[PDB]
Subunit: 455 residues, 3 copies
């Protein structure tokens, strides 16, 4: 049986944030959540997360995923572990202790760590990593066999010891029953540290091993925003790598921003500086061009989103959007819809093959198929208090620069004259014209400011 | 005499693409095309490209640049070379064999390789490179003199051999007559490999040399999208380096996207995240700001394109465009034209010094010089079936938010009243007003929803 | 007493620019200005900048910050120093000689250099740096004690010397009185070089030391645009690091463009590809999304700027702007103002809680609080010659797609009908309607082009 303890009871200062550190986001979810997902690879029978500062925010994020215990004050990693004792005391198994601020440790690394632990019959295994700049890290001193002898902190290190490149990531697997017996010994003999338990086990000459991360960047502990941006870069290359391996082309995967749960079908083409966030799905052969920003939306197959922002919406196959369009929450663009430059669609369903190419606002409308909106078309939905709905049937022709004042209905095949203000229904097959009549006055431009003579 | 054989008969799986691998683009042209351009540096008398999968797509891309031969099925690099035998058999000269999927090898490297080959009287020269991680590569085993003894594959390598850092890039120069005699020997004695020919030459103790690429990244073989994005990064730094050496300033040449044939005059200033594609030309002192996207367009000298998209158009000296404007195919912006924010110009010619600063669509128009378009101006060109042309003379003043319904003509110096719908011609020096007359109704706002009392 | 001499009398060719080299910008100010700011850390009693080519442009930039001297022609770094002799000759102190084209040397490095010089009682101290590729640099030859023996140029170097990794950055501290005596000796015995003075001091066996930069990139001399972009990258990481340490989150600090004097409060969140320029200030908890571009503007606390461009303006707490909006010079957005997509505000003050969500131009207006602008609203301010002002009171409702022709006044609580053209004042509490009346014609759509039957 595997257990997991997650330390998320962080008090520290360098984030300069009211938000507790582990809840700071990387690729769309909290650090603490990345860690929970790696922890899931060991299939723990119990996961206890230790909360402290702003416990309830943390508890909202992992609600129903983990048991919680609270450490009422800072007193070391030892005390933090000791808060889990009433849940874990005496159970037989292997317990991972991991911090909620090392969001880059992979599930695959944690499985390798638990496997090493079990296979070598360690009582403790320290997850280590190798760096050419170990300043500040506790060092792993091995004897020649090559068991861990001890962990030596910077401030207590000899000069030969300072040259050890193998350092303590602060992540461990312990035989569970022994972990708690040792902690109680340390507890009654005393701020205490989980590293103290390594001391106890060397005193009883129980076997302490060390499993070395192949990639040191995975060991990053995030204490400030500079490390958080480092984590972000690392995770971005990771997620974009997965996308590319699956058949997604990236002009620049080092500068394209795709959250952890975004899904992307093979043959997608993504230019640099594209942003996909939340529960976004992109269908096969879809092209996303530089500046495109999609939050919580489904885009179908064969679409082209050019430099446009799509929020909480659904977009069918073959749709073209942009450049410079805004699809705002609860819109649906049916198959082969064209939305052009400087068009906003808000809360509206747009039937298949319909076109709005320019300078148009469609707000709170239900629109049929094969509709044309001339440039400058405005739907008017909000009077200061009520929001009204417009219903536009199939094959309606809304002439350029007209104003459709809801609640109105445009019937199938109707037409609205360019420049009209529309305040009443237009039946199927009817036209409606609400505009003023051109009157020319010869020669009069001669007396106006723009005229070349008056210059 | 130099000859070149290009291997482009790729079957492989990791691209997950219907598009044959060598046709995947890097900086605006196919890998295979980058390779053809490096191959051109050796001035070959014959270039034979070996096609296989989807031969005709490949043949379209190199049409009239190379002879083609087809390998009907996968049977090794040896067989692929052997398909060129009826073209090259018996000719006297030095033959480069190169893959169409190594798009970063430079012309200058290939010239250095052919020079080394000729000067050292090699019968074969392997293009090699040095890496600290040679896993998976065939290794170059030299004796002390230091001729090539052999090429050792991973799966056949001794452990001392596994530590060789000199690896086979899979690019070679051969004495031509000997290449084909050796291949026929291997052929009749047998999937066969071009590497087998190195074996034959060591059997006859003919001289096999090795020319080492100074930059290992040049040796990249692209097998999947992760390598394709690597190639893209490498080529981007290359092209941007050339631009900078020639006098172009880059806020961030690591994140600016300029295709291989774009031309850029000295003194240009390019912010990060700009995109130039296709046959684009940018004149002296032109400023391009972050987000700008130019495809197949000529921009003159002293212009400022702020965050705007210009397609298949021509833009004269001194023009300012943006932010957030769209110049769509077949437009011309004359000298000192201003196009402002949220303006689309489509298929229109705009005479010198004309201004459209806001929220305007100019579609299918011929526009004179010194024209002003007030904000919200819409040209209406398409009725559902016909597309019409508008003709606007010099010094016309089109008032804000008016609607110009084509086919109409606005004569020199004419003026259109703000808010008008225009459906007939306006003569030179005339004004035209087609709008409704303001009627005020005192106190009535008191009974509407927006009014502070009704809140 | 410390003195500083800055060499800014650059003639060279590889910039391909009319602009003198040191005036080329990095993060919003000239190289020469970065250098002046590092020089300020030593608290010099005198700073003399040596100008040559286009002296007056240079003199404008440092006007009132430094004494100037002119070198009328290229004759070496020795001559350039010698131009400062009438200002500095005979004064007792330590003189830094530094080039105006090494914009990455830090104030902290220069203080460490002056401290080393004084503490070791050097007569000269060369600022050195260590690189694994020293080709082209003069090398520092030390004896074992380990004083500087000499500086050896590439073209005069022995082969053992060519392997020295310690190179001359071309920055020095000198005992001032000795500097000038030595230069005059070299002068009367002779193009001459500041390095010649090291020769003189070794002849008199005066103590020549060397202080080694910890970071070699700091030593970059900018001679062309490729190095200028390198400087830009280095400075960008520096400025963004400072921001992060202070509590600003960066999705990608390697691709976010913040000038040297921009100020940013803790808890700000900045997506990649954001641009802050000039004297911009960003308040606490403000969110800036990808594409945002702010020049010389103050943004208050709790605002959200989504993909929008703000120039020379002021923006209060809680304001939301974007996506795709343009705030142009001399605008003020009061508290909780919403500016939505495809809206331009130019030279206007917008009272608190006012909303313009779409497709609107507000030009030269004074706007009260709680105003609503329906989509498509256009203010008309310029007639070809005069620019007029519009005054819009509190709680005005300007209906969608209307045209407000200045000079007009909309009184408190007034309403303008959607689609209206407004040419006269609307009193407080009045409505104004200036639009044409809808007329429907049944069945007539049947004979138009869009109709499904006519397809
Ligand atoms: C040229 O494109 C248009 C022309 C046009 O009127 C000629 C109108 S209109 O809207 O003014 N009129 C419709 C129309 C279409 C084709 C041919 C003729 C017409 N109109 C002819 C004039 C009108 C006659 O009005 C009446 O019937 C009044 C009542 C009576 O006389 O009894 C209507 C049809 C609209 C457009 N196009 C667009 O608005 C869309 C542009 C785009 O998609 O970007
Ligand atoms: C203030 O800027 C404008 C004012 C204006 O009317 C006063 C008009 S207008 O278009 O309504 N009229 C033209 C005009 C210009 C200057 C001075 C006066 C006028 N108009 C005065 C009222 C009109 C009189 O109408 C008739 O002649 C009716 C026939 C008759 O009485 O016989 C026309 C000129 C346009 C603008 N400006 C813009 O549209 C462009 C804005 C931009 O570039 O962003
Ligand atoms: C539905 O939203 C609107 C409706 C509307 O008329 C019903 C008008 S209106 O501008 O045409 N009229 C104002 C109005 C509001 C609420 C309820 C009624 C009205 N109008 C009723 C019709 C009008 C009657 O006109 C006259 O009084 C003529 C004179 C007379 O009969 O004596 C005015 C009020 C405006 C809007 N909304 C917007 O423009 C803003 C949209 C946005 O913020 O994006």
């Amino acid at each position: 049986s595997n257990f997991a303890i997650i330390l998320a009871a962080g008090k520290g200062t360098r984030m300069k944030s009211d938000l507790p550190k582990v809840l700071h986001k990387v690729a769309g979810i909290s650090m603490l959540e990345h860690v929970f997902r790696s922890v899931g690879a060991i299939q723990p029978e119990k996961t206890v997360t230790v909360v402290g500062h702003k416990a309830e925010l943390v508890e909202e994020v992992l609600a129903e995923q983990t048991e919680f215990v609270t450490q009422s004050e800072q007193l070391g990693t030892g005390h933090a572990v000791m808060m889990t004792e009433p849940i874990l005391e005496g159970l037989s198994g292997h317990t991972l202790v991991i911090a909620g601020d090392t969001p880059l440790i992979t599930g695959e690394s944690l499985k390798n760590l638990i496997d090493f632990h079990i296979n070598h019959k360690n009582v403790a295994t320290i997850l280590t990593a190798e760096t050419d700049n170990p300043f500040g890290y506790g060092r792993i001193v091995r004897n020649d066999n090559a068991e861990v002898l001890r962990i030596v902190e910077q401030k207590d290190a000899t000069d030969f010891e300072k040259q050890i490149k193998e350092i303590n990531t602060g992540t461990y697997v312990f035989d569970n029953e022994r972990l708690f017996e040792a902690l109680k010994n340390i507890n009654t003999n005393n701020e205490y540290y989980i590293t103290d338990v390594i001391g106890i086990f060397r005193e009883t000459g129980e076997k302490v091993g060390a499993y070395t991360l192949k990639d040191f960047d995975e060991s990053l502990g995030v204490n400030d925003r500079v490390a958080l941006a480092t984590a972000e870069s690392v995770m971005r290359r990771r997620i974009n790598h997965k996308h590319m391996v699956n058949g997604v082309s990236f002009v620049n995967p080092e500068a394209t921003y795709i959250d952890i749960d975004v899904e992307i079908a093979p043959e997608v083409q993504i230019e640099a500086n594209v942003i996909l966030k939340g529960q976004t799905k992109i269908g096969a052969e879809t092209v996303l061009t530089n500046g495109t920003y999609v939050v919580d939306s489904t885009i179908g197959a064969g679409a082209v989103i050019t430099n446009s922002m799509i929020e909480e919406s659904s977009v069918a196959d073959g749709v073209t959007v942009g450049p410079y369009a805004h699809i705002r929450p609860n819109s649906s663009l049916g198959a082969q819809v064209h939305i052009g430059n400087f068009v906003e669609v808000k809360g509206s369903s747009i039937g298949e093959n319909t076109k709005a190419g320019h300078l148009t606002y469609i707000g709170n409308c239900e629109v049929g198929s094969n509709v044309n909106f001339g440039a400058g078309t405005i739907t008017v939905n909000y009077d200061g208090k009520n929001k009204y709905k417009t219903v536009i049937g199939d094959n309606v022709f809304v002439g350029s620069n007209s104003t459709i004042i809801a609640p109105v209905e445009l019937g199938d095949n109707s037409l609205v004259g360019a420049g009209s203000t529309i305040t009443k229904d237009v039946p199927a097959d009817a036209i409606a014209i609400g505009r003023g009549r051109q009157i020319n006055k010869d020669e009069y431009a001669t007396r106006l400011p723009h005229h070349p003579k008056n210059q």
